[PDB]
């Protein structure tokens, strides 16, 4: 793997102590989200990461059961189209064997993006098939 | 004019009569040694007591009632208050639980 | 004297075993509660 | 014993117990089966599976040639439990628990 210079420089910094939109308690799934947010903030584009997670979720639906334990993101073609920050993070997880936290790091990243963009999300819990009627 | 509760996270693990909670990102958080309600149904709740507050954000919960109804992934609401029970001369001659339920 | 000596020698053996077991249980509890953090090393350069 | 495929490599050895890290693709090993650790190209030591971890690591109890076992050696899977010779052809003989004379 040949990570870009920018990500290499950021990975060696104490970015964990930098300022963020929200003060979330430290956690394994939070460190990766902070790294993605910091990397995306430099470029100023955050929707690219969200698209990457969408592609990952779509790809995972076709991968064999327990793909996160035999995972090789480099060999997987679906992840070849991901952005450098997301691909670097996936390799970062695969090295530590924490690829099972993909669906939770994304949640944190979305929370940071929404806070930065000043968006408040309201969760509407409805019965199976009630998504049609979200009016009241 | 709504009976708005204070959701603080979800139920992660259950081991017998105790449980663990994972807080949802960007939520108020729960206080130590307080009572919480696990929404086993849209109208039914199970009582729990906060016992641990870990660095990871996970919360240790001591279940008190309706344990069989508790499942992983359920929602948790925080009352934000310690345990209070009925007291007075109107309880004499009765059999009650530690929670005050007759 | 031969019956109280056996119970004395049987007691010391049990006492040593139990005390050691307690300590190791605490050691395992503090090891289990511990969690390793993310490894901040140059994984790519491997 | 008949080997089928490699199922990983020896990782750690603590006395008579050992651990195996999975081979590429994690072929998997049946629980409580017998595995053959290629101590030598022609010599295979016997191990009993006793633990299948979530990460893919296998817990092995070594039976013979424990000293010969070293980390990094390949492990093949028989895919079957332990079976030993039985009948009138064994009477009058001295054997070991693995059935070897």
From Swiss-Prot, chain D:
Residues represented out of the complete protein: 46 to 146 of 584
Lineage summary: Eukaryota, Discoba, Euglenozoa, Kinetoplastea, Metakinetoplastina
Compartment annotation: Mitochondrion; Mitochondrion inner membrane
Domain of life: Eukaryota
Consequences of knocking out this gene: RNAi-mediated knockdown of the protein in procyclic, insect stage cells impairs assembly of the F(1) component and slows the proliferation rate of procyclic cells that are cultivated in vitro, both in the presence and in the absence of glucose in the growth medium. ATP synthesis by oxidative phosphorylation is dramatically reduced in procyclic cells.
Official protein name in the record: ATP synthase subunit alpha, mitochondrial
Subunit structure: F-type ATPases have 2 components, F(1) - the catalytic core - and F(o) - the membrane proton channel. F(1) has five subunits: alpha(3), beta(3), gamma(1), delta(1), epsilon(1), plus the additional subunit P18 (Tb427.05.1710) that is not present in F(1)F(o) ATP synthase from metazoa. Subunit P18 (Tb927.5.1710) interacts with the alpha subunit with a 1:1 stoichiometry; the interaction is direct. Subunit gamma is part of the central stalk. F(o) has three main subunits: a, b and c.
Function: Mitochondrial membrane ATP synthase (F(1)F(o) ATP synthase) produces ATP from ADP in the presence of a proton gradient across the membrane which is generated by electron transport complexes of the respiratory chain. F-type ATPases consist of two structural domains, F(1) - containing the extramembraneous catalytic core, and F(o) - containing the membrane proton channel, linked together by a central stalk and a peripheral stalk. During catalysis, ATP synthesis in the catalytic domain of F(1) is coupled via a rotary mechanism of the central stalk subunits to proton translocation.
Family: Belongs to the ATPase alpha/beta chains family.
Native source organism of the sequence: Trypanosoma brucei brucei
